[PDB]
Amino acid sequence: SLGTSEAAPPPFARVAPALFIGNARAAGATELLVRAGITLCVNVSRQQPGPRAPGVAELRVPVFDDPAEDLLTHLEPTCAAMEAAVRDGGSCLVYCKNGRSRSAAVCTAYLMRHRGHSLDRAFQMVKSARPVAEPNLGFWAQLQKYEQTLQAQAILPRE
Amino acid sequence: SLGTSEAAPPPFARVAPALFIGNARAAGATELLVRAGITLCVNVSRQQPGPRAPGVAELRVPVFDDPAEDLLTHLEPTCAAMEAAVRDGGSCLVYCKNGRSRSAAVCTAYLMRHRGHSLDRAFQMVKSARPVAEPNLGFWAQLQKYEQTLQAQAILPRE
Ligand code: NA
Ligand code: NA
Ligand SMILES: [Zn+2]
Ligand SMILES: [Zn+2]
Ligand SMILES: [Zn+2]
Ligand SMILES: [Zn+2]
């Protein structure tokens, strides 16, 4: 509403061009999703609702927020879906229930994979957009393994 | 089991290198998934179960099998996730509840997008692997629109 501020904050925030992080309350925020030009919601949860907005695709990454969970195997295909939506001109929103561990880990992976950032730089960007972003320590280890794989693959430099 | 045949058929079939189509009974077929080297299940449903197999990622594409449903917007990011899993060496299984409309449409999209096949050739390949494959007519129209977009993008030839 062209006012006047919005009392409640938006349920997401911009991390980088065409990339947003948020929480599951975004699912129902149809008008905000359309206004931001989001075309893909990456729902990193097993049971959180998805969007029902016109022109907005959902991809669900059904992982528990647990250090023993295998986020790693999901990272490469998830990041590829994200990049394809981005290169086709849409924006991507990555959310989980509370916008903390799972969505942070996925956004961090994407920034390393497709924006050329080291793990530390990528996580700093997520943290700046959303201070409560905090991948669990199991996911942090998996992100380090992904980073090393990216280096071996010449996607990231050793530096 | 090295026998002796398998009484019940496998819940999927090979469409092309690194690409399988099947139904939701595949979700629980842990040993068959591992044996086929499947690393990504694309679950094209809202409520069908996913795999719980080690080293197997799931991506859910939560669309109803209805001609009015917007499969189209999901196609590009879904196919990109599939190609990334494939290029990293895994095989991809695309399933829906009954292995008919939704999974057929997604496999057909992938073959056009990443294997250079026209819509007709791509669908013939799916049909050959799984005769009951049959995208609903709404999805067929969306696939035609995707094909035209791919042509405009120089991904497919006009021929
Ligand atoms: Na660590
Ligand atoms: Na048609
Ligand atoms: Zn829950
Ligand atoms: Zn939970
Ligand atoms: Zn159902
Ligand atoms: Zn249903």
CA B145 – CA B138 distance, rounded (Å): 11
Identify the burial level of B93 via C-beta atoms within 10 angstroms of its C-beta, where 0-12 means exposed, 13-18 middle and 19 or more buried: buried
Q: How far apart are CA B140 and CA B136, in angstroms?
A: 6
Q: Residue A154: inside a domain, yes or no?
A: yes
| Contact residues, chain A, for B84 at CB < 8 Å | 76-77, 79-81
Is residue A5 in some structural domain?
no
The 3-state secondary structure of chain A, one letter per residue: CCCCCCCCCCCEEEEECCEEEEEHHHHHCHHHHHHCCEEEEEECCCCCCCCCCCCCEEEECCCCCCCCCCCHHHHHHHHHHHHHHHHCCCEEEEEECCCCHHHHHHHHHHHHHHCCCCHHHHHHHHHHHCCCCCCCHHHHHHHHHHHHHHHHCCCCCCC
- Does the distance separating the beta carbons of A40 and B55 come in below 8 Å? no
Residue B112 burial by CB count (10 A; 0-12/13-18/19+): exposed, middle or buried?
A: buried
Distance CA B139, CA A9 (A): 37
At B105, give phi and psi (nearest 5°).
-65, -45
Number of domains in chain A: 1
Q: Compute CA B48 distance to the chain's CA centroid, rounded to the nearest angstrom.
A: 15
Q: Would you tell me the crossing angle of helices B137-152 and B119-129 to the nearest 10 degrees?
A: 130
Domain that holds residue A157: 11-159
Alpha carbons within 13 angstroms on the beta-carbon side of residue A95 total: 26
With breaks defined as C to next N over 2.5 Å, after which residues does chain A break? none
Solving technique for this entry? Answer: X-ray
B94 CB-near residues (< 8 Å, 6+ apart): B19, B20, B21, B22, B41, B42, B44, B82, B103, B106, B107, B110
Residue B2 inside a domain? The answer is: no
Contact list, A59 vs chain B (CB under 8 Å): 59-61, 74, 77-78, 81
| Integer CA distances (angstroms), A40 to A72, B70, B95, in order | 21, 13, 21
The answer to the question of residue A86 being in a domain is yes
Instruction: Work out whether the CA dihedral A18, A23, A24, A25 comes out positive or negative.
Output: negative
Cis ω on the peptide bond leading into residue B4 (within 30° of 0)?
yes
SS3 B14: strand
Q: Is residue A53 part of a domain?
A: yes
Q: What b/e readout covers B129-149, taking b as 16+ CB neighbours within 10 angstroms?
A: bbeebbbbebbbebbeebbeb
Q: From the CA of B61, how far away is ligand 5's center (Å)?
A: 14
Strand partners, A12: A22
Q: How far apart are CA B120 and CA B113, in angstroms?
A: 13
> Is there a domain that residue A22 lies in?
yes
Q: What CATH number should be reported for the domain holding residue B41? A: 3.90.190.10
- Cβ-Cβ contacts under 8 Å for A55 (sequence gap 6 or more): A34, A39, B70, B73
Q: Which amino acid does the sequence have at B56?
A: V
β-partners of residue A13 are A21
Query: What resolution, expressed in A, was reported for this entry?
Result: 2.0
The type of residue at B107 is: C
